[PDB]
Design a protein around this ligand. Structure first.
Ligand SMILES: CNc1nc2cc3c(=O)[nH]c(N)nc3c(CCc3ccccc3)c2[nH]1
Ligand SMILES: CNc1nc2cc3c(=O)[nH]c(N)nc3c(CCc3ccccc3)c2[nH]1
Ligand SMILES: [Zn+2]
Ligand SMILES: [Zn+2]
Lengths: 355, 355
């Protein structure tokens, strides 16, 4: 029987690592890309914010939990819900949690953990505040301090639910905006509490790649080396490659799914907008090397035709290709680190993706 | 090597028949349902009207024809284009053809056959006029007479193109509105010209099932018994069953695809609207007996959730199920006729579908 949670590092190159997370429901190869569940991947994402509103977490539990509901028996990660509340919901913030609205709802560390328990997710995120960007030092500090108090409450709530403590894992989320001293204080607080994995929160919120990479440069080394590192909200293929170079093991992003509905396909030569007329007679597959079923069977010209015609099949094929591209990217990353040629891979990737 | 076109009847019950059409690109089991290509089936439909406008028939030919373009190497049927022009396009009608509009376009028997040749379809429809309903006897007669002149021009155009005459098949289309004498004159004219198959045109245009069945009762026996009979535009499962009882061998309809994008799923107990709240906690598959991949894996509750959330996956799963349901319906029809229990099947089908 697999353990509740075990992370093992099989190979390293620079700050990059490759390895596995073993959980009861399966093995997760790292670095990992985690696609939205409602879009091969070893873990998918649930949507806590949506599910708590429709049908509600209690109702999901009545239906057997998210694994049964979605027809997915492997690991699922859920976010803690506050990031989406603050991005999508009127809101009232306090030390207890956040209230938002046609019924009104509250989220607190305790309620967030309970919702994630009712959903049945395998990787549970602590309930944090994603500090807006830009933030002054004072506001970033006050926000991070609240998040750390909330991280301890999240830990205690998770540990109080036997089924959760014995079968799921809990990740703490580092905050501190772009400030090295606050990132350090946050890392120290999280390590003192103790988590199964550590996320870098508060990025991919408008700061741009240069600034994000600068923050990762000092922030990731502050986290425990022997635990997984999850960069929340990232990202584009080039962001992923550079974050792996900086020690990140896990990623999520709305790009493959969002792009697949808006006519954008990822390729090794960069993204293409398949609706553009230049593709109307292009008999090549979406990407010349991609092994996905779409690229084995259909041309850019046909996918262009379907999307221009408003056909659902076109968006489905774009999304299938994009998900597959992302998993091929992660496999090439893992293999290159394991073979000691990741630095070269990243250089080659960038030269081609941006040509 | 299969022949260009051979229809063989393997079994009969009443006016119902089951058998096969052999063509160079494959065998078509009858009675057959022919789904839209852009949505297992033995033949799919191309969309002449759309393709002649985007990217254009010449461009499709440059890309290798519709089989290569769509990635489908089995038979394809195309309509002749006038039905869609008159349904979707300002229009100017004359003995030569129809003009319509941002460029202006013409369709004539000769141009329709050439477009279908450039598309590369295996079953080509003659260029006809689908008489509006209701029609007076005089207008129905004038319209049908024009369609018969156009059927002869369609035959001659098809026979002039060697690649088409040797590798494709041409169906003539009966018109005459709801009038027995005009349907007879039309059948006689088509048989004198000679076609590989015969379609019943001018129905599914607002007349209702009772009237449609009444017209089929006298119209289908007028067509050559030893050739396939295609009822254009039909239809709902109950329309299909009753049309098979009246001697029809081939069907098309926008229902499975249209329904799959609008939240309607076909089941043996009738259609259901999956968006309705009554499905939010229903753990049964879309249909309790359906063998499709959707019903093997996912519940009504999850598909309801996806569609309510606007997720493309939901529409895709609905459409996959609906296409599969239709092919299972046709298989049950074929098997029941071959086993001499089709009359009982139809009675059982109706009792359950309408309960
Ligand atoms: C796009 N940029 C982005 N930056 C983020 C920062 C944070 C952050 O600081 N805290 C939390 N908890 N989540 C964040 C998220 C959402 C990630 C997510 C959503 C849904 C499912 C699974 C995971 C972010 N997303
Ligand atoms: C929905 N009702 C409906 N009644 C129809 C009558 C006719 C008729 O009298 N003549 C012709 N030529 N077509 C008809 C069609 C369109 C069928 C079609 C469209 C697209 C692809 C393949 C086949 C009809 N459709
Ligand atoms: Zn691909
Ligand atoms: Zn099904």
């Amino acid at each position: 029987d697999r353990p509740r949670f075990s992370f093992s590092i099989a190979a390293r190159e620079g700050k990059a690592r490759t390895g596995t997370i073993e959980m009861k429901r399966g093995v997760i190869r790292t670095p990992a890309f985690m696609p939205v569940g409602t879009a091969g991947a070893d873990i998918i994402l649930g949507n806590t914010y949506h599910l708590m509103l429709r049908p509600g977490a209690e109702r999901i539990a009545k239906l057997g939990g998210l694994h049964s509901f979605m027809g997915w028996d492997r690991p699922i990660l859920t976010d803690s819900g506050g990031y989406q509340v603050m991005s999508l919901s009127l809101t009232k913030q306090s030390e207890e949690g956040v209230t938002f609205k046609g019924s009104r709802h509250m989220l607190s560390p305790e309620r967030s953990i309970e919702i994630q328990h009712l959903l049945g997710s395998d990787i549970v995120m602590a309930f944090d505040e994603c500090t807006p960007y830009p933030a002054t030092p004072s506001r970033a500090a006050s926000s991070m301090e609240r998040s750390m108090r909330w991280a301890k409450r999240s830990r205690d709530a998770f540990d109080s639910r036997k089924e959760q403590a014995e079968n799921a894992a809990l990740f703490g989320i580092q905050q501190g905006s772009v400030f090295e001293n606050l990132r350090q204080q946050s890392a120290d607080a999280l390590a003192e509490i103790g988590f199964d994995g550590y996320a870098v929160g508060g990025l991919a919120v408008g700061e741009g790649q240069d600034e994000m990479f600068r923050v990762l440069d000092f922030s990731v080394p502050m986290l425990p080396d022997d635990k997984p590192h999850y960069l929340m909200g990232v990202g584009k293929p080039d962001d992923i490659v550079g974050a792996v170079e900086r020690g990140i093991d896990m990623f999520d992003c709305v790009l493959p799914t969002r792009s697949g509905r808006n006519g954008q396909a990822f390729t090794w030569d960069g993204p293409i907008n398949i609706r553009n007329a230049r593709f109307s007679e292009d008999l090549k597959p979406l990407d010349s090397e991609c092994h996905c079923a779409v690229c084995q069977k259909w041309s850019r010209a046909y996918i262009h035709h379907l999307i221009r015609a408003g056909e659902i099949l076109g968006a489905m094929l774009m999304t299938e290709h994009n998900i597959a591209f992302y998993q091929q990217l992660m496999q090439k990353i893992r293999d290159s680190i394991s073979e000691g040629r990741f630095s070269q891979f990243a250089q080659d990737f960038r030269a081609r993706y941006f040509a």
